[PDB]
Amino acid sequence: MLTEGISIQSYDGHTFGALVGSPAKAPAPVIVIAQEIFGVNAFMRETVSWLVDQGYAAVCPDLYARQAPGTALDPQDERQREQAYKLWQAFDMEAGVGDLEAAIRYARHQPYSNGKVGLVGYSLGGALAFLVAAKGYVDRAVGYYGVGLEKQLNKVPEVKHPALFHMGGQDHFVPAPSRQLITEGFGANPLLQVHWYEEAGHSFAATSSSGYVASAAALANERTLDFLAPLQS
């Protein structure tokens, strides 16, 4: 689901929709949310709601619009999960970073914007959060269980604004050797924080996922809100 009428343009000219939530009290800092592999679906709608209820505005861009605009897949449906994995395998990560850069610029000057913008991404979006943090487009970035971060460690010195990552200790997209690489590599830059939730795997913050872990989602979410609070006016 997206907000009708909302359109954002990327540097290369491509335009895409987004799901937007404005809080009752504005102006407010705006959080661009970077999707998982299912498009802008119920969990993204829930993430927009959570942030708006905490007093932020939120913009979740349709990152799959270069492939199939308006994709919103149900993770409980096997056929739609297969579609999600196909779209993820074809996903242009660089174009994704560029579309998020465009959404961040957009978020700086909407009616409800206070001019500060943060980014929170999940899974595919968590990997994109790190890439965006290396570019320096946002004030603060957060990534929940980003995949493949152990392959982007050459970018650690490029991060010049804070970025926070929540990783599951039982997430097998990040096995022990990968966790060691990430832990050692991110350890070199104090602007990066990475927490490991030992009893959680992938998707632990999504209440409808079989991987949901209430205690880890709650600790991570509170850390995320404390990390974003300085963006408030």
PDB file of C-alpha atoms in Angstrom:
ATOM      1  CA  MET A   1       0.000   0.000   0.000  1.00  0.00           C
ATOM      2  CA  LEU A   2       1.200   3.451  -0.858  1.00  0.00           C
ATOM      3  CA  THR A   3      -0.192   6.957  -0.256  1.00  0.00           C
ATOM      4  CA  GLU A   4      -1.991   8.059  -3.432  1.00  0.00           C
ATOM      5  CA  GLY A   5      -0.466  11.067  -5.102  1.00  0.00           C
ATOM      6  CA  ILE A   6       2.892  10.861  -3.485  1.00  0.00           C
ATOM      7  CA  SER A   7       5.738  10.837  -6.088  1.00  0.00           C
ATOM      8  CA  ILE A   8       9.525  11.160  -5.574  1.00  0.00           C
ATOM      9  CA  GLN A   9      12.147  11.452  -8.300  1.00  0.00           C
ATOM     10  CA  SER A  10      15.540   9.889  -8.289  1.00  0.00           C
ATOM     11  CA  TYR A  11      18.657  11.564  -9.731  1.00  0.00           C
ATOM     12  CA  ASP A  12      18.366   9.495 -12.876  1.00  0.00           C
ATOM     13  CA  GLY A  13      14.815  10.646 -13.502  1.00  0.00           C
ATOM     14  CA  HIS A  14      12.944   7.530 -12.298  1.00  0.00           C
ATOM     15  CA  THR A  15       9.850   8.338 -10.143  1.00  0.00           C
ATOM     16  CA  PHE A  16       8.254   6.172  -7.480  1.00  0.00           C
ATOM     17  CA  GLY A  17       5.467   6.207  -4.859  1.00  0.00           C
ATOM     18  CA  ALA A  18       5.699   5.898  -1.065  1.00  0.00           C
ATOM     19  CA  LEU A  19       3.598   5.253   2.009  1.00  0.00           C
ATOM     20  CA  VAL A  20       3.600   8.391   4.157  1.00  0.00           C
ATOM     21  CA  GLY A  21       2.546   9.014   7.773  1.00  0.00           C
ATOM     22  CA  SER A  22       2.480  12.571   9.287  1.00  0.00           C
ATOM     23  CA  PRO A  23       2.366  12.878  13.230  1.00  0.00           C
ATOM     24  CA  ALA A  24      -0.159  15.109  14.967  1.00  0.00           C
ATOM     25  CA  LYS A  25       2.549  17.377  16.155  1.00  0.00           C
ATOM     26  CA  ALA A  26       4.656  18.832  13.391  1.00  0.00           C
ATOM     27  CA  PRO A  27       7.013  19.887  12.243  1.00  0.00           C
ATOM     28  CA  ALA A  28       8.872  16.720  13.175  1.00  0.00           C
ATOM     29  CA  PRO A  29      11.952  14.792  12.043  1.00  0.00           C
ATOM     30  CA  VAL A  30      11.101  12.428   9.198  1.00  0.00           C
ATOM     31  CA  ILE A  31      12.188   8.827   9.034  1.00  0.00           C
ATOM     32  CA  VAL A  32      12.647   7.219   5.585  1.00  0.00           C
ATOM     33  CA  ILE A  33      11.945   3.479   6.035  1.00  0.00           C
ATOM     34  CA  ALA A  34      13.836   1.025   3.791  1.00  0.00           C
ATOM     35  CA  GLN A  35      11.732  -2.038   3.013  1.00  0.00           C
ATOM     36  CA  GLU A  36      12.361  -5.792   3.323  1.00  0.00           C
ATOM     37  CA  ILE A  37      12.062  -8.004   0.278  1.00  0.00           C
ATOM     38  CA  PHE A  38       8.182  -7.944   0.314  1.00  0.00           C
ATOM     39  CA  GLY A  39       7.687  -4.409  -0.871  1.00  0.00           C
ATOM     40  CA  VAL A  40       5.585  -1.845   1.033  1.00  0.00           C
ATOM     41  CA  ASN A  41       3.401  -4.299   2.867  1.00  0.00           C
ATOM     42  CA  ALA A  42       1.661  -4.801   6.214  1.00  0.00           C
ATOM     43  CA  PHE A  43       4.892  -4.760   8.178  1.00  0.00           C
ATOM     44  CA  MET A  44       5.915  -1.484   6.523  1.00  0.00           C
ATOM     45  CA  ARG A  45       2.455  -0.070   7.293  1.00  0.00           C
ATOM     46  CA  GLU A  46       2.991  -1.151  10.918  1.00  0.00           C
ATOM     47  CA  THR A  47       6.496   0.483  10.995  1.00  0.00           C
ATOM     48  CA  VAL A  48       5.032   3.764   9.706  1.00  0.00           C
ATOM     49  CA  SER A  49       2.369   3.549  12.418  1.00  0.00           C
ATOM     50  CA  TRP A  50       4.943   2.825  15.167  1.00  0.00           C
ATOM     51  CA  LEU A  51       7.054   5.797  14.154  1.00  0.00           C
ATOM     52  CA  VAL A  52       4.174   8.208  13.795  1.00  0.00           C
ATOM     53  CA  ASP A  53       2.926   7.141  17.247  1.00  0.00           C
ATOM     54  CA  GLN A  54       6.442   8.001  18.623  1.00  0.00           C
ATOM     55  CA  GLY A  55       6.157  11.447  17.097  1.00  0.00           C
ATOM     56  CA  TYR A  56       8.075  11.126  13.825  1.00  0.00           C
ATOM     57  CA  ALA A  57       6.796  11.529  10.288  1.00  0.00           C
ATOM     58  CA  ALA A  58       7.621   8.471   8.114  1.00  0.00           C
ATOM     59  CA  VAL A  59       8.114   7.914   4.349  1.00  0.00           C
ATOM     60  CA  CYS A  60       8.451   4.325   3.054  1.00  0.00           C
ATOM     61  CA  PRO A  61       9.427   4.470  -0.662  1.00  0.00           C
ATOM     62  CA  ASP A  62       8.405   1.866  -3.226  1.00  0.00           C
ATOM     63  CA  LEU A  63      11.936   0.557  -3.907  1.00  0.00           C
ATOM     64  CA  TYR A  64      10.581  -2.167  -6.188  1.00  0.00           C
ATOM     65  CA  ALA A  65       9.072   0.467  -8.563  1.00  0.00           C
ATOM     66  CA  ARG A  66      11.953  -0.038 -11.025  1.00  0.00           C
ATOM     67  CA  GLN A  67      10.797  -3.619 -11.409  1.00  0.00           C
ATOM     68  CA  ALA A  68       7.099  -3.768 -10.565  1.00  0.00           C
ATOM     69  CA  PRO A  69       5.516  -0.681  -8.994  1.00  0.00           C
ATOM     70  CA  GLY A  70       3.219  -1.244  -6.086  1.00  0.00           C
ATOM     71  CA  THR A  71       4.479  -4.678  -5.036  1.00  0.00           C
ATOM     72  CA  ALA A  72       3.199  -5.558  -1.554  1.00  0.00           C
ATOM     73  CA  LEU A  73       3.647  -9.238  -0.829  1.00  0.00           C
ATOM     74  CA  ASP A  74       2.126 -11.306   1.990  1.00  0.00           C
ATOM     75  CA  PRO A  75       4.950 -13.190   3.755  1.00  0.00           C
ATOM     76  CA  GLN A  76       2.517 -15.830   4.974  1.00  0.00           C
ATOM     77  CA  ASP A  77       1.715 -16.811   1.338  1.00  0.00           C
ATOM     78  CA  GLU A  78       4.283 -19.259  -0.131  1.00  0.00           C
ATOM     79  CA  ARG A  79       3.729 -18.145  -3.704  1.00  0.00           C
ATOM     80  CA  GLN A  80       4.229 -14.467  -2.767  1.00  0.00           C
ATOM     81  CA  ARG A  81       7.368 -15.324  -0.787  1.00  0.00           C
ATOM     82  CA  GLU A  82       8.742 -16.947  -3.987  1.00  0.00           C
ATOM     83  CA  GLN A  83       7.918 -13.741  -5.848  1.00  0.00           C
ATOM     84  CA  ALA A  84       9.691 -11.724  -3.128  1.00  0.00           C
ATOM     85  CA  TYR A  85      12.884 -13.803  -3.471  1.00  0.00           C
ATOM     86  CA  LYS A  86      12.794 -13.386  -7.270  1.00  0.00           C
ATOM     87  CA  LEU A  87      12.463  -9.555  -6.955  1.00  0.00           C
ATOM     88  CA  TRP A  88      15.255  -9.461  -4.365  1.00  0.00           C
ATOM     89  CA  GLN A  89      17.636 -11.449  -6.583  1.00  0.00           C
ATOM     90  CA  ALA A  90      16.998  -8.926  -9.435  1.00  0.00           C
ATOM     91  CA  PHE A  91      17.206  -5.913  -7.194  1.00  0.00           C
ATOM     92  CA  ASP A  92      19.687  -3.176  -8.199  1.00  0.00           C
ATOM     93  CA  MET A  93      21.264  -2.207  -4.909  1.00  0.00           C
ATOM     94  CA  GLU A  94      22.952   0.925  -6.231  1.00  0.00           C
ATOM     95  CA  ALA A  95      19.690   2.147  -7.765  1.00  0.00           C
ATOM     96  CA  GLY A  96      18.053   1.361  -4.387  1.00  0.00           C
ATOM     97  CA  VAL A  97      20.554   3.584  -2.551  1.00  0.00           C
ATOM     98  CA  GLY A  98      19.888   6.289  -5.090  1.00  0.00           C
ATOM     99  CA  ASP A  99      16.119   6.063  -4.640  1.00  0.00           C
ATOM    100  CA  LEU A 100      16.543   6.202  -0.860  1.00  0.00           C
ATOM    101  CA  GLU A 101      18.854   9.287  -1.361  1.00  0.00           C
ATOM    102  CA  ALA A 102      15.922  10.871  -3.279  1.00  0.00           C
ATOM    103  CA  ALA A 103      13.445   9.956  -0.569  1.00  0.00           C
ATOM    104  CA  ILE A 104      15.757  11.477   2.083  1.00  0.00           C
ATOM    105  CA  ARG A 105      15.992  14.710   0.096  1.00  0.00           C
ATOM    106  CA  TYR A 106      12.167  14.754  -0.262  1.00  0.00           C
ATOM    107  CA  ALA A 107      11.822  14.185   3.484  1.00  0.00           C
ATOM    108  CA  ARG A 108      13.776  17.327   4.240  1.00  0.00           C
ATOM    109  CA  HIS A 109      11.136  19.706   2.972  1.00  0.00           C
ATOM    110  CA  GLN A 110       7.618  18.435   3.261  1.00  0.00           C
ATOM    111  CA  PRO A 111       5.067  20.504   5.201  1.00  0.00           C
ATOM    112  CA  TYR A 112       5.548  18.340   8.261  1.00  0.00           C
ATOM    113  CA  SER A 113       9.424  18.269   8.075  1.00  0.00           C
ATOM    114  CA  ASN A 114      11.631  19.840  10.717  1.00  0.00           C
ATOM    115  CA  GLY A 115      14.570  19.368   8.341  1.00  0.00           C
ATOM    116  CA  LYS A 116      16.251  16.426  10.084  1.00  0.00           C
ATOM    117  CA  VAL A 117      15.893  12.969   8.485  1.00  0.00           C
ATOM    118  CA  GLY A 118      16.792   9.553   9.737  1.00  0.00           C
ATOM    119  CA  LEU A 119      16.637   6.200   7.973  1.00  0.00           C
ATOM    120  CA  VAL A 120      15.484   2.848   9.437  1.00  0.00           C
ATOM    121  CA  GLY A 121      15.740  -0.257   7.233  1.00  0.00           C
ATOM    122  CA  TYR A 122      14.956  -3.967   7.670  1.00  0.00           C
ATOM    123  CA  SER A 123      16.707  -6.950   6.039  1.00  0.00           C
ATOM    124  CA  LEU A 124      17.264  -5.859   2.399  1.00  0.00           C
ATOM    125  CA  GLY A 125      16.613  -2.353   3.887  1.00  0.00           C
ATOM    126  CA  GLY A 126      19.181  -2.962   6.671  1.00  0.00           C
ATOM    127  CA  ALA A 127      21.874  -3.591   4.021  1.00  0.00           C
ATOM    128  CA  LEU A 128      20.741  -0.447   2.214  1.00  0.00           C
ATOM    129  CA  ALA A 129      20.913   1.482   5.566  1.00  0.00           C
ATOM    130  CA  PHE A 130      24.622   0.736   5.813  1.00  0.00           C
ATOM    131  CA  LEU A 131      25.237   1.754   2.209  1.00  0.00           C
ATOM    132  CA  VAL A 132      23.333   5.004   2.750  1.00  0.00           C
ATOM    133  CA  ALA A 133      25.288   5.646   5.957  1.00  0.00           C
ATOM    134  CA  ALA A 134      28.569   5.266   3.975  1.00  0.00           C
ATOM    135  CA  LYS A 135      27.271   7.927   1.475  1.00  0.00           C
ATOM    136  CA  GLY A 136      26.416  10.282   4.324  1.00  0.00           C
ATOM    137  CA  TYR A 137      22.938  11.156   3.099  1.00  0.00           C
ATOM    138  CA  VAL A 138      21.181  10.953   6.456  1.00  0.00           C
ATOM    139  CA  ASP A 139      21.567  12.365   9.890  1.00  0.00           C
ATOM    140  CA  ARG A 140      21.271   8.899  11.534  1.00  0.00           C
ATOM    141  CA  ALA A 141      20.746   5.438  10.053  1.00  0.00           C
ATOM    142  CA  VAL A 142      19.475   2.205  11.594  1.00  0.00           C
ATOM    143  CA  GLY A 143      19.572  -1.267  10.110  1.00  0.00           C
ATOM    144  CA  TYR A 144      17.742  -4.300  11.505  1.00  0.00           C
ATOM    145  CA  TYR A 145      19.280  -7.606  10.373  1.00  0.00           C
ATOM    146  CA  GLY A 146      20.844  -6.282   7.196  1.00  0.00           C
ATOM    147  CA  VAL A 147      22.172  -9.060   4.944  1.00  0.00           C
ATOM    148  CA  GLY A 148      25.665  -9.182   3.531  1.00  0.00           C
ATOM    149  CA  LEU A 149      27.247  -6.470   5.643  1.00  0.00           C
ATOM    150  CA  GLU A 150      30.432  -8.594   5.934  1.00  0.00           C
ATOM    151  CA  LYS A 151      31.025  -7.904   2.230  1.00  0.00           C
ATOM    152  CA  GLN A 152      30.853  -4.115   2.559  1.00  0.00           C
ATOM    153  CA  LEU A 153      33.456  -3.639   5.329  1.00  0.00           C
ATOM    154  CA  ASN A 154      35.754  -1.569   3.111  1.00  0.00           C
ATOM    155  CA  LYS A 155      33.096   1.164   3.558  1.00  0.00           C
ATOM    156  CA  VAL A 156      33.414   1.439   7.383  1.00  0.00           C
ATOM    157  CA  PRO A 157      35.754   4.468   7.242  1.00  0.00           C
ATOM    158  CA  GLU A 158      33.370   6.265   4.954  1.00  0.00           C
ATOM    159  CA  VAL A 159      30.651   6.459   7.669  1.00  0.00           C
ATOM    160  CA  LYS A 160      30.656   9.948   9.047  1.00  0.00           C
ATOM    161  CA  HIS A 161      27.241  10.164  10.776  1.00  0.00           C
ATOM    162  CA  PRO A 162      25.883   7.657  13.350  1.00  0.00           C
ATOM    163  CA  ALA A 163      24.552   4.328  12.253  1.00  0.00           C
ATOM    164  CA  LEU A 164      23.053   1.650  14.506  1.00  0.00           C
ATOM    165  CA  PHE A 165      22.641  -2.025  13.618  1.00  0.00           C
ATOM    166  CA  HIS A 166      20.610  -4.726  15.370  1.00  0.00           C
ATOM    167  CA  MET A 167      21.620  -8.228  14.475  1.00  0.00           C
ATOM    168  CA  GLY A 168      20.320 -11.572  15.537  1.00  0.00           C
ATOM    169  CA  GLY A 169      22.691 -14.055  17.136  1.00  0.00           C
ATOM    170  CA  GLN A 170      20.716 -16.940  15.563  1.00  0.00           C
ATOM    171  CA  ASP A 171      20.349 -15.275  12.162  1.00  0.00           C
ATOM    172  CA  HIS A 172      21.910 -17.632   9.739  1.00  0.00           C
ATOM    173  CA  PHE A 173      22.253 -14.996   7.052  1.00  0.00           C
ATOM    174  CA  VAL A 174      25.016 -13.868   9.493  1.00  0.00           C
ATOM    175  CA  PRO A 175      26.909 -16.948  10.605  1.00  0.00           C
ATOM    176  CA  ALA A 176      29.667 -16.846  13.169  1.00  0.00           C
ATOM    177  CA  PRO A 177      32.500 -16.007  10.731  1.00  0.00           C
ATOM    178  CA  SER A 178      30.438 -13.155   9.237  1.00  0.00           C
ATOM    179  CA  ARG A 179      29.501 -11.859  12.728  1.00  0.00           C
ATOM    180  CA  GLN A 180      33.200 -11.852  13.671  1.00  0.00           C
ATOM    181  CA  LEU A 181      34.114  -9.840  10.531  1.00  0.00           C
ATOM    182  CA  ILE A 182      31.383  -7.351  11.059  1.00  0.00           C
ATOM    183  CA  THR A 183      32.061  -6.990  14.762  1.00  0.00           C
ATOM    184  CA  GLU A 184      35.759  -6.413  14.205  1.00  0.00           C
ATOM    185  CA  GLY A 185      35.299  -4.163  11.181  1.00  0.00           C
ATOM    186  CA  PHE A 186      32.543  -1.936  12.586  1.00  0.00           C
ATOM    187  CA  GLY A 187      34.533  -1.815  15.805  1.00  0.00           C
ATOM    188  CA  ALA A 188      37.008   0.510  14.133  1.00  0.00           C
ATOM    189  CA  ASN A 189      34.589   3.453  13.761  1.00  0.00           C
ATOM    190  CA  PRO A 190      32.815   4.838  16.894  1.00  0.00           C
ATOM    191  CA  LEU A 191      29.992   6.269  14.758  1.00  0.00           C
ATOM    192  CA  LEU A 192      28.863   2.657  14.190  1.00  0.00           C
ATOM    193  CA  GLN A 193      27.093   0.619  16.836  1.00  0.00           C
ATOM    194  CA  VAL A 194      26.151  -3.011  16.384  1.00  0.00           C
ATOM    195  CA  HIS A 195      24.207  -5.020  18.974  1.00  0.00           C
ATOM    196  CA  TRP A 196      23.724  -8.795  18.818  1.00  0.00           C
ATOM    197  CA  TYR A 197      20.488 -10.267  20.206  1.00  0.00           C
ATOM    198  CA  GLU A 198      21.544 -13.731  21.218  1.00  0.00           C
ATOM    199  CA  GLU A 199      18.175 -15.372  21.276  1.00  0.00           C
ATOM    200  CA  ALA A 200      16.888 -13.934  18.009  1.00  0.00           C
ATOM    201  CA  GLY A 201      17.269 -14.712  14.317  1.00  0.00           C
ATOM    202  CA  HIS A 202      16.217 -12.860  11.192  1.00  0.00           C
ATOM    203  CA  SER A 203      12.936 -10.849  11.183  1.00  0.00           C
ATOM    204  CA  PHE A 204      12.849 -10.667  14.931  1.00  0.00           C
ATOM    205  CA  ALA A 205      11.128  -7.302  15.134  1.00  0.00           C
ATOM    206  CA  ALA A 206       8.156  -8.262  12.895  1.00  0.00           C
ATOM    207  CA  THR A 207       5.274  -9.387  15.097  1.00  0.00           C
ATOM    208  CA  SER A 208       3.762 -11.596  12.354  1.00  0.00           C
ATOM    209  CA  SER A 209       6.997 -13.436  11.533  1.00  0.00           C
ATOM    210  CA  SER A 210       7.725 -16.911  12.931  1.00  0.00           C
ATOM    211  CA  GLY A 211      11.090 -15.341  13.829  1.00  0.00           C
ATOM    212  CA  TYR A 212       9.501 -12.706  16.059  1.00  0.00           C
ATOM    213  CA  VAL A 213      11.144 -12.414  19.517  1.00  0.00           C
ATOM    214  CA  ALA A 214       9.289  -9.956  21.719  1.00  0.00           C
ATOM    215  CA  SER A 215      12.101  -9.213  24.173  1.00  0.00           C
ATOM    216  CA  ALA A 216      14.702  -8.589  21.384  1.00  0.00           C
ATOM    217  CA  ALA A 217      12.232  -6.501  19.282  1.00  0.00           C
ATOM    218  CA  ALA A 218      11.419  -4.399  22.313  1.00  0.00           C
ATOM    219  CA  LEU A 219      15.089  -3.808  23.312  1.00  0.00           C
ATOM    220  CA  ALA A 220      16.058  -3.050  19.733  1.00  0.00           C
ATOM    221  CA  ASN A 221      13.090  -0.758  19.141  1.00  0.00           C
ATOM    222  CA  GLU A 222      13.785   1.242  22.285  1.00  0.00           C
ATOM    223  CA  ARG A 223      17.436   1.577  21.271  1.00  0.00           C
ATOM    224  CA  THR A 224      16.281   2.749  17.834  1.00  0.00           C
ATOM    225  CA  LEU A 225      13.989   5.430  19.367  1.00  0.00           C
ATOM    226  CA  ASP A 226      16.624   6.593  21.774  1.00  0.00           C
ATOM    227  CA  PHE A 227      19.076   6.807  18.842  1.00  0.00           C
ATOM    228  CA  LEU A 228      16.647   8.814  16.712  1.00  0.00           C
ATOM    229  CA  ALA A 229      15.397  11.180  19.491  1.00  0.00           C
ATOM    230  CA  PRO A 230      18.158  13.790  18.982  1.00  0.00           C
ATOM    231  CA  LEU A 231      16.561  14.507  15.544  1.00  0.00           C
ATOM    232  CA  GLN A 232      13.503  15.910  17.405  1.00  0.00           C
ATOM    233  CA  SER A 233      13.090  19.698  17.625  1.00  0.00           C
TER     234      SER A 233
END
